[PDB]
Paper text:
FlSqgA from Flavobacterium sp. strain K172 was selected for further study. Further analysis revealed that the small increase in product formation observed in the presence of Mn2+ was a result of improved enzyme stability; thus, Mn2+ was included in subsequent kinetic studies. Another feature of NAD+-dependent glycosidases is the ability of many members to act on both α- and β-linked glycosides. Both ternary complexes were essentially identical, with respect to the active site interactions. Three-dimensional X-ray structures of complexes with SQ and NAD+ provide insight into the catalytic mechanism, which involves transient oxidation at C3.
These new SQases operate through an oxidoreductive mechanism that results in net hydrolysis and involves a catalytic NAD+ cofactor. The SqgA proteins adopt a two-domain fold with an N-terminal dinucleotide binding Rossmann domain and a C-terminal α/β dimerization domain. The structures reveal homodimers, consistent with molar mass analysis using size-exclusion chromatography-multiangle laser light scattering in solution.
Numbering used by the authors:
A (entry chain C), B (entry chain A): 9 to 371
């Protein structure tokens, strides 16, 4: 197995999930980790469990000559500046950049121009499509088992945002807002599943429950914690997103349903084991419901135990790394492009704007 | 048992469901049926199974001296004119008037003035709240078991509109549109459950699938067959409605979820037995999902077999009749008032307008 040397820029929560997944893939060697918070470097080094060179600044990692590929897992509002440095570095390194790829309309416009002239693989790390149960419903939709598709519903019911370094995720300025930070994944799935582009978005949401009295270094937390979104698409399909960040009692965290003119399909995805009751491992299900003849078929979709244990996104990060590896080695394309990243972000920003202004937003 | 003599104005599909439910209630006697379609009279008479007087015109039924109470189950666009004749008749008869109570903004304004001066019970027959599983979740919400309520989602996945006499239900002018005809029930449940009034509605929907090969003197149906709706409320709660009229493969026809800041509750309601596979009786469920401690509780909500067999609305029409009986006997209130009927209609009209204009509508 050809060795790829990975550099991690950002060494927090999600970086450690990247570490655990790369450990499952022969040929993967972390050589370099950059993070301006020493305790993050220590904790990530322990997770890696073998010697790496650490850096406080990403520019030193880029100049290190230690790496064949990068992973960026720093806070959302830092993604553009890190990417700009990579583009100007002359290293020509591949990049897996965590979602959201950026956090504002200005950032998005700039990244679009810059990324156009960069030739190395740039993959946006929206991994949800590779969850085995999600893959089944995408294959169903694309194969025509559902007929012509008209509707897509995504319901996410989960716990409040977790505690992060410097509390970065508690503020819209740093995150893009909830509909970008948490929901870009879902807007991307909408494009993928419907194979269509959005034309109009409306959202209603509020900051109603979570983190209400929390101030950090003189700032008040201002993130939406529940919302509904309706998205219209060019081809006369429509999708709906429901989010609650205070519905963590729900055994199933995600429900995704697709309705076509020949059938319906629905996946239910359990809470990750590390957040659920220690005890009852529940499996994800896919239920296919043809219009005629009546007779829904439901089955469980198992994930390999090691793939599943390595992350909190139901095996998806592992398949993302297989895909990125093939891109680095020039044996595969980038499945999730900058342009996918930009569309999902602009959809999320349009949603955040709709929530504020109480009006639908055109795209 | 105190006898109530019922007059039916409109003797089609839903009237026969009224007949079957009144048959379960001691003291109920149908004496009079008015319908301008002879075949409807015959078919309803057979359902009743005992001699009744029949009329082609409702005015003759009102003058008959045969009745203590009325049920109106004629096409939606006729409800107002029949009610006006009852109000001006001087009979002072109680009325159970099928939903939607009316079909346009003008009708609604007129009915509001007229109904104010009428003193006999006028009950709008939105019965869904009395479905045993729906009753449980309303009791849960109102009792505070969920904490403060923030979100309400209603998903209806069902078969295309059934065939009616004169195909009345295939046209928006005659129905109020899909969001009035089919969805007034749901908008009313939103008001009931949230105990709040709507301020803004947005809906996306289309006529995408159904009734495309049905031609009626050269006209096609113009009714929506799928939609999403978001409703904001005065108190900063929000609800979402999802409708598909071409999702009849779904084992569960209705899903309703309420999310509060202490817990979530969710009911699933099966397709009525005469529309589903002959064979698998599925029960309705209610699942209670507290935020803390984790531990969802799910149970079946059984309905009495006779109550269930008498209707296609999961036992609800029977409890509606018990309620209306008490109103007629002067011993109970009208649970679902004209004003409830008018609000649900105005909500639906606003949704129909939003679908057309691609903008949110104020209330
Ligand atoms: N794809 C997914 O499923 C998923 C899941 C979780 C997080 N994320 C994403 O991962 C990223 C990080 O989130 P997290 O949960 O790991 O947060 P975290 O707070 O645990 O980690 C962020 C780390 O970045 C470091 N950092 C801050 N500024 C930096 C800079 N300029 N350069 C380098 N490092 C910097 C911090 O010191 C910290 O160690 C975000 O973009 C988030 O959206 C994605
Ligand atoms: N609450 C519910 O669950 C529910 C269920 C089904 C129908 N409905 C309502 O019941 C009503 C009737 O629908 P249906 O499914 O029984 O339709 P249907 O077409 O089966 O019956 C309608 C009947 O009304 C008669 N009619 C037509 N014009 C009339 C008039 N001017 N005066 C008197 N009768 C007239 C027709 O001849 C026919 O027999 C509608 O308002 C519909 O919205 C409610
Ligand atoms: O739970 S938090 O860590 O607060 C927030 C994160 O949660 C999930 O894992 C999502 O995939 C991710 O996109 C998001 O950044
Ligand atoms: O199936 S149809 O009869 O066409 C349409 C009817 O559907 C259900 O029975 C609803 O309760 C009723 O409101 C509506 O009028």
């Amino acid at each position: 197995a050809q060795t790829i040397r990975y550099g991690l820029i950002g060494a927090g929560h999600m970086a450690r999930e990247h570490v655990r997944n790369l450990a499952l893939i022969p040929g993967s060697l972390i050589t370099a980790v950059a993070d301006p918070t020493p305790s993050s470097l220590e904790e990530t080094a322990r997770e890696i469990g073998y010697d790496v060179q650490t850096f406080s600044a990403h520019k030193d990692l880029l100049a290190s000559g230690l790496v064949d590929a990068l992973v960026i897992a720093s806070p959302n509002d830092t993604h553009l500046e890190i990417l700009k440095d990579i583009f100007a570095s002359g290293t020509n390194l591949p990049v897996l950049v965590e979602k959201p790829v950026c956090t504002s309309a200005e950032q998005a416009d700039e990244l679009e121009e810059l990324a156009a002239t960069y030739t190395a693989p740039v993959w946006v790390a929206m991994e949800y499509r590779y969850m085995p149960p999600v893959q089944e419903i995408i294959q169903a939709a694309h194969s025509g088992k559902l007929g012509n598709i008209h509707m897509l519903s995504i319901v996410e019911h989960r716990f409040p945002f977790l505690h992060k370094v410097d509390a970065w995720n508690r503020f819209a300025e740093r995150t893009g807002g909830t509909l970008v930070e948490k929901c870009c994944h879902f807007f991307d799935l909408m494009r993928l599943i419907l194979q269509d582009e959005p034309t109009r978005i409306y959202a209603s949401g509020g900051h109603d429950v979570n983190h209400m009295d929390e101030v950090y270094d003189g700032l008040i937390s201002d993130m939406v914690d529940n919302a509904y979104v309706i998205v219209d698409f060019k081809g006369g399909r429509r999708a709906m997103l429901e989010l609650s960040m205070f519905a963590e009692g729900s055994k199933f965290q995600e429900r995704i349903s697709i309705v076509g003119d020949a059938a319906k399909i629905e996946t239910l995805i359990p809470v990750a084991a590390n957040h659920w009751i220690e005890g009852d491992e529940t499996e994800a299900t896919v239920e296919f419901s043809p219009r005629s003849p009546l007779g829904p078929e439901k089955h469980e979709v198992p994930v390999d135990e090691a793939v599943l244990a390595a992350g909190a996104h139901h095996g998806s990060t592992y398949y993302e790394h297989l895909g990125y590896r093939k891109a680095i080695l020039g044996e595969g394309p980038v499945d999730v492009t900058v342009a996918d990243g930009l569309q999902s972000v602009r959809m999320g920003l349009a949603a955040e704007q709709s929530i504020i202004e109480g009006r639908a937003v055109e795209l």
